[PDB]
Amino acid sequence: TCPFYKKIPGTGFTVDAFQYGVVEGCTAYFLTHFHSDHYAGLSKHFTFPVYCSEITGNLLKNKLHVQEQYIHPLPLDTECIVNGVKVVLLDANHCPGAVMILFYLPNGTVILHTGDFRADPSMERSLLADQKVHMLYLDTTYCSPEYTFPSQQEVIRFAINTAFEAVTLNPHALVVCGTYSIGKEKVFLAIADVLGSKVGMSQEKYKTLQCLNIPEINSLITTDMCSSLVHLLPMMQINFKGLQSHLKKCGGKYNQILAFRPTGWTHSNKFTRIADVIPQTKGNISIYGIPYSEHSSYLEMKRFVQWLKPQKIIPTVNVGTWKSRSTMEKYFREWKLEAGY
Ligand code: NI
């Protein structure tokens, strides 16, 4: 049964609610982004209207085989009427195709559902500038002050310089980047661009990347592994055993691996600056964990909320324990007292 924080009151709508069977009264199912916890339940047998971005729609059709007649893509930054209700989709700054949804309810209430997002000051100059929001359904993944991490630009600068140094010292080194979902593509694209290489990968991952509307993608990726010195591998293979096994398959072309594991936050963020990050090393294999986040830091989240000044906040992450719910409620009240709304 569908929980309350996935329903939009006063409408026939749900958000990211495909794992509950047929939801009573639902006339349109919104999907914020193509991550498995959110799409859980969709397939070729789904026969209700799905509303989403263009990119999410390409993934639903090609990867999950949802039939074309049930996929309803909407453009971004554009007022659209769905089942008699005005909606807008906004870029969430999460993975490719990810959106926030603004709903203009028939009674005058305005609701923003962030989906998953990485708040940014640029959002203060979207269509959100123009009006009041009564209810915010908020991605609270990192809603605690211990959650700190650098900008995505700093993290990419670190990865490019690390890869470029290693391969210039040793032309026979291979770079490997872990993946398990869409998102974080800048990590492997930036490294391959500095090395003058295409990115090599499986047929299955190539298919996924071909759905993402990335400009000039045919120039950047390939399924011919032997032609490439940046390889993508499943995240589970990014360990000394998996990497050893991969280096055997390359036919004595390479004699060293440098690997990257993009994570979210880890507690080594509580002590170490990005610049000071060191790898784990066994023999001719080195593995870097890099804190490339596609969710708001505490401070980015707080800035956004204090600017938007919502009347009520409904968290969508960390909702399962009393201690988490209490902690989030305390911070929301501080933020409101501090800013005066
Ligand atoms: Ni996500």
UniProtKB/Swiss-Prot annotation:
User: What effect on the protein does mutating H295A have, as reported in its record?
Assistant: Impaired nuclear focus formation, reduced interaction with PIAS and increased sensitivity to cisplatin
Tissues with expression: Expressed in brain, heart, kidney, liver, pancreas, placenta and skeletal muscle.
Task: Explain what induces or represses this protein's expression.
Answer: During mitosis. The mRNA encoding this protein contains an internal ribosome entry site (IRES) in its 5'-UTR. This 5'-UTR generally suppresses translation while specifically promoting expression during mitosis, when cap-dependent translation may be impaired.
* Cell compartment(s), UniProt: Nucleus
Q: Origin, by domain of life? A: Eukaryota
Q: Tell me, how does this one assemble?
A: Binds constitutively to TP53BP1. Binds CDC27, which is itself a component of the anaphase promoting complex (APC). Binds PIAS1.
Family as reported in the entry's similarity comment: Belongs to the DNA repair metallo-beta-lactamase (DRMBL) family.
Q: What does this protein do?
A: May be required for DNA interstrand cross-link repair. Also required for checkpoint mediated cell cycle arrest in early prophase in response to mitotic spindle poisons. Possesses beta-lactamase activity, catalyzing the hydrolysis of penicillin G and nitrocefin. Exhibits no activity towards other beta-lactam antibiotic classes including cephalosporins (cefotaxime) and carbapenems (imipenem).
Name of the protein: DNA cross-link repair 1A protein
- Which gene underlies this protein? DCLRE1A
